[PDB]
């Protein structure tokens, strides 16, 4: 029983951008009304209730590598 785990990974992620100019985020907010009474969350819940919200994201490169290696022997 011989298991050889040898992932040869050569990877490059490259973003080339000269200049990012005028980014204008001007939003006139509104109205959010939320009515509830009983909220039950047990395990690993991500919940946003009644949000007015503004996200301006300007990453120079925004590159993301996700690598998962799982080996299980039963």
- Asked if residue 56 lies in contact with residue 25, where contact means CB atoms within 8 angstroms, the answer is yes
Q: CB of residue 34 vs a second copy: minimum separation in angstroms?
A: 4
- Cβ contacts of residue 45 below 8 Å, gap of 6+? none
Residues 65 and 7: their CA atoms lie apart, in Å, by 16
# of chain residues touching a second copy (CB under 8 A): 74
Residues 3-62 that bind a second copy (CB under 8 A): 3-62
User: Minimum distance from CB of 21 to a second copy (Å)?
Assistant: 5
Minimum CB–partner distance for residue 24 and a second copy (Å): 5
């Amino acid at each position: 029983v011989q298991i050889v785990y040898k992932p040869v990974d050569l990877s490059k992620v490259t973003s080339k951008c000269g200049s990012l100019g005028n980014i204008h985020h001007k939003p006139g907010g509104g109205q959010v009304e939320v009515k509830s009474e009983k909220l039950d969350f047990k395990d690993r819940v991500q919940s946003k209730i009644g949000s007015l919200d503004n996200i301006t994201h300007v990453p120079g490169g925004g590159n993301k590598k996700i690598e998962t290696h799982k080996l299980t022997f039963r």
